[PDB]
Design a protein around this ligand. Structure first.
Ligand code: NDP
Ligand code: NDP
Ligand code: W65
Ligand code: W65
Lengths: 286, 286
């Protein structure tokens, strides 16, 4: 159980450090605001008094702060502390941010991989958690068994920005799901329908079926052949006004769902109403 | 196996009529454009020469056309044909549309229930299909065993507009899901990543986990207590710019995902960044 250091003790960094502790690792912790270390000290963490101390304590240095600007602030406070260490940066950012941080790390003698945590904090250490990783394969292979205590490791390749592209794509997908949740639950709550009961009984099973449907849509995207699948855009463009008008009648804003209806309408206006929803991917691409 | 008539032989009405035929019902079919009956004639349907003939053939009359205006056009072509028949109207519409059509039906001597088909055509007759129904319970009970061949029957109550509210809420949820799919797949395709492979391997498992998460969100909505759940809006408002900027870098429009980020930003600006996503429901409500 190799020593690990965690920089960033917010909700997620706390979950990561806690899981290292459960798995028997000497877990050194650092946070910009030191009071946040107290809960972790109480369950066995070693609270580093400085950035340099936290870096010195371990060879595997996990950074889970806020954004890339925050990561660079921490790295630059102790520029010589990182040499011959492996930085695993789990802080949300763009592909470009990962490449920028990697360039800095390599120039300061450190090894670097970037990862994207596909979990909320309570999922860490649980079977459904997964973390995407990218950067030099030999670097990842040196730390993958320690990192595996957090979740399933999904190494996507050598390009250090690639895990971030996968991450942000998955988050995009989730934000659409949550847009749908918000709209659906506002509509039922407008009629005093139990939200949890509706969501467990009706919404989740429907979304499960329509999630499986995404396989067919994705095949159509790859084929660039946008079959209706039995559900043409012409037909959907005549249902969309009903969803909008019913929402207006219930006092529910349509802001979260209007964009896809405008895209569907545009495809109908282009003369392609006989196609299905897989057509919409290319419509938002360059 | 009681005789059934189907009005509307588009993708969905064809699927409904086909399933009645497989289950041994004398299945009478009608379509505004008569050529569309030919595939169903070939597998045993009785093609009605008129609206009145189709109504006369059965006591259970299913209407699956386009919108409420279309339903009223069919009903009004033969106003005396509906007396002492049960109309099951599966044509998409608002709660108000169902109430309007029901008022007409009752004034012309017919029984009426409205339903919302939670299925695409290939799902009809399969275990995952479900149809929502509302209107007089005694009317529904008279036809529920015949209707059960199509999917699971979910009778929601006596108010004839209620199935349509549930339907449009579920469709709203699905359109958010599909917004997420579209954005996520455009981002990976911008980097030449296989769409089907990404969706099957990464997107679907992530959406499955985040769909289960909707139970927690829904409980928080019912409680009007918008705990962060480990994922505060303040934190999400610092990730959202990364998703937007990465999308811009890949040439992908952000139109489908920008609205939820604007709502998150607004909640942070209101001083409620410490809350979680369940807060967004009330934000779009009256
Ligand atoms: N929570 C979640 O569900 C998920 C989070 N993520 C990502 O994980 C990361 C952490 O999220 P989470 O823990 O929830 O966020 P929190 O808001 O709970 O914590 C943010 C952390 O970043 C630190 N930080 C902010 N600015 C700086 C700075 N300039 N220098 C040093 N440290 C700084 C904070 O320190 P201080 O205490 O001093 O403010 C704190 O440790 C983010 O990048 C997030 O996008 C990934 C997946 C899920
Ligand atoms: N397909 C799907 O995935 C789903 C569809 N639905 C709903 O089911 C219904 C049917 O959808 P679907 O079959 O896919 O749509 P289609 O576009 O395939 O068929 C539309 C049907 O409506 C008929 N119609 C349109 N205008 C009129 C009119 N004025 N008078 C009489 N008939 C008319 C068409 O007749 P004609 O051939 O003469 O044009 C045709 O039979 C819609 O309300 C839809 O929202 C529900 C869930 C899923
Ligand atoms: O638009 C509708 C739909 C589209 C795809 C799948 C399921 C339903 C609904 F109005 F028919
Ligand atoms: O914003 C993020 C997130 C929010 C909820 C669930 C999972 C992830 C990510 F940037 F952290």
């Amino acid at each position: 159980n190799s020593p690990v250091s965690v920089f960033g003790l917010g909700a997620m960094g706390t979950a990561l450090a806690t899981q290292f502790l459960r798995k028997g690792h000497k877990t050194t912790v650092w946070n910009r605001t030191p009071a946040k270390a107290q809960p972790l000290i109480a369950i066995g963490a070693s609270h580093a008094p400085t950035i340099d101390s936290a870096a010195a304590a371990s060879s595997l240095l996990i950074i889970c702060q806020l954004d890339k600007a925050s990561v660079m602030q921490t790295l630059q406070q102790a520029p010589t502390a990182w040499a011959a260490k492996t930085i695993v940066d789990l802080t949300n950012g763009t592909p470009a941010h990962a490449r920028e941080t990697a360039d800095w790390a390599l120039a300061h003698g450190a090894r670097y991989i970037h990862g994207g945590i596909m979990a909320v904090p309570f999922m860490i250490g649980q079977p459904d958690a997964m973390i995407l990783y990218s950067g030099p394969a030999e670097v990842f292979e040196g730390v993958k068994d320690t990192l595996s205590v957090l979740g399933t490791n999904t190494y996507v390749g050598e390009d250090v920005g690639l895990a971030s592209l996968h991450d942000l794509a998955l988050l995009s997908g989730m934000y659409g799901l949550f847009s749908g949740f918000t709209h659906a639950v506002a509509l039922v709550q407008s009629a005093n329908i139990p939200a949890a009961g509706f969501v467990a009984t009706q919404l989740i099973p429907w979304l499960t079926a329509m999630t499986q449907h995404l396989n067919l849509l994705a095949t159509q995207v790859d084929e660039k052949d946008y079959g209706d699948g039995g559900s043409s855009l012409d037909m959907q463009a005549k249902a969309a006004p009903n969803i909008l008008e019913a929402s207006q009648a219930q006092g529910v804003s349509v802001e979260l769902i209007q964009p896809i209806f405008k895209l569907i309408e545009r495809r109908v206006e282009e003369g392609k109403g006989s196609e299905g929803l897989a057509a919409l991917v290319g419509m938002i691409m360059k």
